[PDB]
A paper describes a structure:
The fold of the N-terminal barrel confirms that it has evolved from the C-terminal polypeptide by gene duplication; comparisons of the barrels provide an intriguing example of homologous domain evolution in which binding sites are obliterated. The C-terminal barrel incorporates the zinc ion that binds and activates Hcy.
The carboxyl group of Hcy is bound by the backbone amide and the side chain hydroxyl of Ser411, and hydrophobic contact to the Hcy sulfur is provided by Met468. Hcy binding induces significant changes at the metal site. Binding of the substrate sulfur to zinc does not proceed by a simple dissociative reaction in which sulfur is substituted for the oxygen of Glu642. Instead, Hcy approaches the metal ion from the side opposite the Glu642 ligand. In the structure of the binary complex determined at pH 5.2, displacement of Glu642 and inversion at Zn+2 are incomplete. When Hcy binds, the side chain of Met468 alters its position in concert with backbone displacements of the aspartic acid and methionine residues that start the helix.
Residue numbers in the entry: 1 to 350, 361 to 376, 378 to 733
The structure:
Amino acid sequence: TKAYAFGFPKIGEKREFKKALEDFWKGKITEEQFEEEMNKLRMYMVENYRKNVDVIPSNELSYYDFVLDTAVMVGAVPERFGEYRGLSTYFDMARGGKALEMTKFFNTNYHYLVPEIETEEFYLLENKPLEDYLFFKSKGIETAPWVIGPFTFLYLSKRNGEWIRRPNQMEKLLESLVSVYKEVFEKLVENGCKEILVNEPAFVCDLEKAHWDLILNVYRELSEFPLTVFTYYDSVSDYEACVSLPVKRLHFDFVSNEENLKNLEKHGFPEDKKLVAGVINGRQPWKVDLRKVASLVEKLGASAISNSCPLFHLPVTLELENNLPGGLKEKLAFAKEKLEELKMLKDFLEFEDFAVDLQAVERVRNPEDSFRREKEYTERDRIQRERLNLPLFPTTTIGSFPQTPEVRKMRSKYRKGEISKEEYEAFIKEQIKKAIELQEEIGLDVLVHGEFERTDMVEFFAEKLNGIATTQNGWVLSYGSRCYRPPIIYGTVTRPEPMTLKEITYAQSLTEKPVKGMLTGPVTIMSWSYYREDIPEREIAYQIALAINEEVKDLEEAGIKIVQIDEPAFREKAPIKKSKWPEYFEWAINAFNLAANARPETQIHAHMCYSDFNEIIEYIHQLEFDVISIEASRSKGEIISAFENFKGWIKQIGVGVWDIHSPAVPSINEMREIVERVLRVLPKELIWINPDCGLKTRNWDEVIPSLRNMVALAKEMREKFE
Ligand SMILES: N[C@@H](CCS)C(=O)O
Ligand SMILES: OC[C@@H](O)[C@@H](O)CO
Ligand SMILES: [Zn+2]
C-alpha cells in the first residue's frame, strides 16, 4: 500500500523558519544565509517524510504563503510592484503597505494572501516547482511537486475587488491559466518527475454543476501528466463528477465528513483510477485506533493512504511536551507522530473515558429556560437604560489597550513563575488604575480594564478552565512568521473558580462609570483550540458555555452592569459548505445564549469582527445580546446595510468608527461620515460610538489622540440630534 503525506509543518522544531524570516527582514542575515537556513528546513522535512512515507512532497517550503507562490509562478504580480525582482518583490507582496490582502485559508487558522488578477493573460514567470525538484534531485532524492490546482487558485483570488467564483468569471481566465500549468508540468515530466500532487480543496465548497463542467475541461487538457489530485476539509460537492476527472490517482478526505465514504460505497469508485484514502486527521492531535482505520482501507480496497488534510494545522512534535496534564501526552499525536501512524498503517497493511466530570456532563445533559433570558429585549432595554443613565451616542472601547514592553515582560515573568501572584497582582492594578484615570480624563462613557494580564483572548481562559490544557512547544503557523500554540480541550470543561472578578471588580471600584465585564465566547474558545472528537462539538460548546455563564453570574453578583462576550468565531467556525450552516448555527446560537444567559438588568454586549453581515444576520438576530459592536470603518458605515434592511431590528449597535490595524489617527470629519451613514435609517438611540476592535496592537501615542476625537465626535453628534 502506497503511503502519502503532505503539509508537514515547515516551521522547524525550534521555529527556525520564523527566526530565519525575521533575521532576513531585520537585516541580521543575507539572502544567501537565509537560503541556507531554508535549505536546511527542506532537508528536515524530507527526512521526516522519507522515514515514514513512500511519496515525498516537494515545493512545500514557501517563504511566506503558497498561494502567493502560485501567483508569482503564473505571472500574477500587481503593477504597483513593478518587475518581480525576487524575494524583495516577493516580500513586498506579502508584507508592508503595498501587500496583498490576507485572509483565512478555508475554515482553518492559516491565512493566505489573496491574488489580484489584473490581466487576462498568465505566463510562466518562475517555475519554483522545478527548481525545488532539481534541488532534491541534486541531493539525490525523488520528490512529487506539491501545487495548488488551477481551479482553486482562481477560486481563492479576486478581480477588480470581487472573488472569481462564478463559472462565467473563471471560464476565460482558466484557459490562459492551464497553459502555464501544462507548461510547468511538461518541464517536470521531462526531468523525470514521476508524480505531481495537485491540491483542489475548492472541490468541497458548494459548487454548481457548471463549476464541474468547467473543472472537467481543465483536467482534460492536463490528462497527459502524472497528476494526483487531493481534496479535503469536507466532502466533494459532486462525487460522480469528481470521480470522472481525467486523473489516474484521486485523494479523498474520509475524516472531516461522512459524505465521501457514504458516496463511494453507494455509487462506487471507478476502476480506471486509484483511490488514496486520506485517513489520518491533520487538524486534530489525537492518537487514533489504527485498527478501525485499517478496516476502512481494507473494506474499500484502497491502494494508498495518507493524511486527510494538510499536517501544517498541527504542531511539529509531541516529543518534549512533558508538562502536560496527567495522562494527556499518552493520547496525543502531532505532525511527526502522524507521519509515524501512517507508516504503522502501511506496515500493518502488508481511551474514551478520559477526563470526565459526570456532574458537569450531566449538568449539560439536563432546563430549557437556561438558553432563554427571563425577559424580552424591549423589557430588558428599559431597565438597563434606567440603570445605566448613558448619554445619547455613548462612547466605549472594545477591551484591550496598548502594551508597554514592561507589561509584556511582567506577564511572562508571572507565567515563568519569576514573580509571585501578589507581585503580578499589584502590577496589573497599577496598570488598570492608570488606564481608568486616562479614560475618565479622555471622556469615555463606558470603560474597560485593558486586558493587560491576558496573553490573548483564548489562552487566558484556557489556563483557567478545567479540561483544557496548553502546551510548551506546540507552535502552529498562522501566517508569515507568526505562530500560535493552540490549547487542547482534552476533557469535560468546568471552571474551578472565578476567572476575571479580581481585575473587573477592582477596575470598577475606581470609577462611578460602568466598567465592562470581558469574556470570550464558547465557540471562539474551541475555534482556536484542538478538542476531543469522541463527543458532539455541540456538547463541548455547551460545557464551555456553562463555564462562562457561571462567570457571568459572578460579575453580576459583584455589581457589574455591563458584560461583553467576544464571539468572533461565530461565523469563522461555520462549515465550509454554506449548505451545512443550518445545523451548525443551531448549536452555535444556543452556546452563545447559554453563555450570555444573564439577568434582565445585565446589559450584554456581543462583539464580532466580520467585515460583512448580509449572510448571517438571520442567525445574529437570534443571539440574546443587548448591543452588538461591529467594525464599520473600512466600509465607512456601509456595513450597516444588513441591519437597516432587517425587518424589525431593534437592538443597539456599537458602530466601529476607527481602523485599529493602521497607526493613523482618524479625523473627526472621518469618523462622522460613518456615524452619519449609520443614522440614515436606524433610530439614533440604538447607536454607540467605539473603535473597530481592541487596541492591544496600537501604541498609546496613536490611541489617546484618536480616542479624544472619538469623544469629540460624539459631543458634536449629540449637539445635532439633540
Ligand atoms: N476584548 C478583545 C476583543 C478582540 S475581537 C479586545 O478588545 O482585544
Ligand atoms: O467556500 C469557502 C470560501 O468561502 C473560503 O473559505 C475559501 O478559503
Ligand atoms: Zn474585533
